[PDB]
């Protein structure tokens, strides 16, 4: 997350923090997640493409801090991981960058709601906000593209949706971008998502309820002019979701 500000997990209670064990007991933050159902988290498949083994990932809800434990947070294993069949990335762009994780705690419980722990509203077929609308993104991603550490407290920041006709442009990302994808940047490019923010939520206020209209997927820079972020547009995966999502 470039620009932005630090938040507590409460401003963003649907966020999920995904860790991978390197073995030894060694864990590292991999990707962000959004909790869409009390037993289901959704992310990007690139986050796990190289190490698909499920018995190997860890999800934390209600976690606002990275290596200190928040109060109220719950820990889960991964009952199942499902990457999108037609996931491709022979190029800058990812395609179909969408993954689901089935979580369950050591006590067998799925996710219990609270002020820390909330689900996120999926969009609906035709409810994508206007271009120029202001959604928020959040995560532990780096705070400068040339940086070594990850910020230890969660961040958030607000970007404005960009029309697909606009970032299909030469100066932008030309043919690299499809209509199953959704661009979004600051208008003076002062703030964006960065490495680490992958798999986290693009959230918009829709008819009141907070909603998950995008997933952090890819972009060229971290907040360069004419080089926005890019998101999996969740409306175009509602069947795939639905299909896989039930189980």
């Amino acid at each position: 997350i470039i620009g932005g500000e630090f938040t507590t997990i409460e401003n963003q209670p649907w966020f999920a923090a995904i860790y991978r064990r390197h073995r030894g007991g060694s864990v590292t933050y991999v990707c962000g997640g959004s909790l869409i159902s009390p037993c289901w988290v959704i992310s990007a498949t690139h986050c796990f493409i190289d190490y698909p083994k499920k018995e190997d990932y860890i999800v934390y809800l209600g976690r606002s801090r990275l290596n200190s434990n928040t109060q109220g947070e719950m820990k889960f294993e991964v009952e199942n991981l499902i990457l999108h069949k037609d996931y491709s990335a022979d190029t800058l762009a990812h395609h179909n960058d969408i993954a689901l994780l089935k979580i369950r705690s050591k006590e067998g419980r799925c996710a219990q709601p609270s002020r820390t722990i909330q689900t996120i509203a999926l969009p609906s077929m035709y409810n994508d906000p206007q271009f120029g609308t202001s959604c928020e993104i959040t995560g532990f991603g780096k705070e400068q593209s040339t940086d070594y550490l990850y910020p230890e407290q969660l961040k958030m920041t607000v970007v404005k949706l960009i029309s697909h006709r606009e970032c299909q442009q030469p100066h932008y990302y030309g043919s690299e971008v499809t209509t199953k994808m959704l661009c979004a940047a600051d208008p003076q490019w002062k703030t964006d998502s960065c490495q680490g923010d992958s798999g986290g939520p693009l959230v918009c206020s829709l008819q009141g309820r907070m909603t998950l209209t995008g997933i952090v997927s890819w972009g060229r820079g971290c907040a360069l002019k004419d080089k926005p972020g890019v998101y999996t547009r969740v409306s175009h995966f509602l069947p795939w979701i639905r299909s896989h999502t039930k189980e």
Epitope: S88, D90, T91, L92, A93, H95, N96, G174, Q195, G221
Partner: antibody, heavy 114, light 112 residues
Framework: QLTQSGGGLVKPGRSLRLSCTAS????????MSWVRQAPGKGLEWVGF??????????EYAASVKGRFTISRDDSKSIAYLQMNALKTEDTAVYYC???????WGQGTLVTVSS | EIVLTQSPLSLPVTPGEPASISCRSS??????????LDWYLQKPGQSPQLLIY???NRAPGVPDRFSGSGSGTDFTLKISRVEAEDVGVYYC?????????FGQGTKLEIRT
């Protein structure tokens, strides 16, 4: 993995279609790249076709965007680089590439000569 | 679009000594850390083979003596210790976006 057929001698201004038959992997899951060399000098990248899952759009290089086009046929699992108005400066050994970069072929020298 | 100049163009080495070529560009990162610069070697014969992909990941089967490194605009390939078989031209390549492009090449000449 990638046998390059087609090619040879052609007169300037004339055309030609280099094909490339693939095996051992799923052809539909990959972009297909093409890179030239031209005897004595280094590599120029020339174009690609996207996976199809990604829209099978094509990018080209500055030199060739006018003349060259580059196709695919998931069915027969081939990629094809059709070169149209052919310039003598187009003489090179042309490799099929698979992916961005994964597995080059052996290429086929095209020589454009009277 | 992106122009790479690699240095040096020829480079003589005694097998068992380490070599180091360096590609200098002007662009290049994505949002997951990876720089989109690859290293090939064309062995005498023909047909380039990919050595390092994505800046620092060694392609499969590529021996352990090769190493991807760099950041920003300055990337460099490294052989801990040359071998007879490593003779060739090395090409670095930029594939962040838009049109792709190569360097001019580096000719590693290697003996009693």
């Amino acid at each position: 993995q990638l046998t390059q057929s087609g090619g040879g001698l052609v007169k300037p201004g004339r055309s030609l279609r280099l094909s490339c038959t693939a095996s051992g992997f799923t052809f539909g899951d990959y972009a297909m790249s093409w890179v030239r060399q031209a005897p004595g000098k280094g590599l120029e990248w020339v174009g690609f076709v996207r996976s199809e899952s990604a829209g099978a759009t094509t990018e080209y290089a500055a030199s060739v965007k006018g003349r060259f086009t580059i196709s695919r046929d998931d069915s027969k699992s081939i990629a094809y680089l059709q070169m149209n108005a052919l310039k003598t400066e187009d003489t090179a050994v042309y490799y099929c590439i698979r992916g961005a970069n994964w597995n080059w072929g052996q290429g086929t020298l095209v020589t454009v000569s009277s | 679009e992106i122009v790479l100049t690699q240095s040096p163009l020829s480079l003589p080495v005694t097998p068992g000594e380490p070599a180091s070529i360096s590609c200098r560009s002007s662009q290049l990162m994505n949002r997951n850390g990876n720089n989109f610069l690859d290293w090939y070697l064309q062995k005498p014969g023909q047909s380039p083979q990919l050595l390092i992909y994505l800046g620092s990941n060694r392609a499969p089967g590529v021996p352990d003596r090769f190493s991807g490194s760099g950041s920003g605009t300055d990337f460099t390939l490294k052989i801990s210790r040359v071998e007879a078989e490593d003779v060739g031209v090395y090409y670095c390549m930029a594939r962040v976006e838009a049109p792709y492009s190569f360097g001019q090449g580096t000719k590693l000449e290697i003996r009693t």
